[PDB]
């Protein structure tokens, strides 16, 4: 019954998969940011050289987005569940999406809201 940021991160990732989302590949991913449809940015972990993560940070910040942290991108690639091959394959996600509203509009959740308020202000 504890409240944690990572516990809400798992919920938001799974419900983003459930409600629209699923932006695999840099293609069809910048269109959501240009139309401001998406509301989250995903940063690949332990990259070869830090220019990739720095550029993702730049495009996240300049688009007025809270700097949401993602750790262990391989685990982040396992968390989607669409890997198939039992557990082999392990495909990750380049960016996140928050279309068609992440939660229900009639009944919203506080697990996302606490992180949103803590990061925005």
């Amino acid at each position: 019954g504890v409240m944690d940021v990572n516990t809400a991160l798992q919920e938001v990732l799974k419900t983003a998969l459930i409600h629209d989302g699923l932006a695999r590949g840099i293609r069809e991913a910048a269109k959501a940011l240009d139309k401001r449809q998406a509301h989250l940015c995903v940063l690949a972990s332990n990259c070869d050289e830090p220019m990739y993560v720095k550029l993702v940070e730049a495009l996240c910040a300049e688009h007025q987005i809270n700097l949401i942290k993602v750790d262990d991108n391989k685990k982040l690639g396992e968390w989607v569940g669409l890997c198939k091959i039992d557990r082999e394959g392990k495909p990750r996600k380049v960016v996140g999406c928050s279309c068609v509203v992440v939660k229900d509009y009639g009944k919203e959740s506080q697990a996302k809201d606490v992180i949103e308020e803590y990061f925005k202000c």
């Binding site: 840099i26 240009d34 139309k35 550029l55």
Partner: protein, 74 residues
């Protein structure tokens, strides 16, 4: 009904596939010694198509939407 001996022409013809893309790098250049955004979005007056749709890189061409808008420098 059976094979009419058609296997010598088009030797296992391949399904249409132009390019296989992992990541776009040359299309993304926001390096102006400040890190600010640099874009070349151009759109036709309409509601279906806007600045969101991507553009085909060319020396003089603006591929936008399905309306086939032609606007050249002559």
């Amino acid at each position: 009904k059976k094979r009419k001996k058609k296997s010598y022409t088009t030797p296992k013809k391949n399904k249409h596939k132009r390019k296989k893309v992992k990541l776009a790098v040359l299309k993304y250049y926001k390096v102006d010694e400040n890190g600010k955004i640099s874009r070349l979005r151009r759109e036709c007056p309409s509601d279906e198509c806007g600045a969101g749709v991507f553009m085909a890189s060319h020396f003089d061409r603006h591929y936008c939407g399905k309306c086939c808008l032609t606007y050249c420098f002559n």
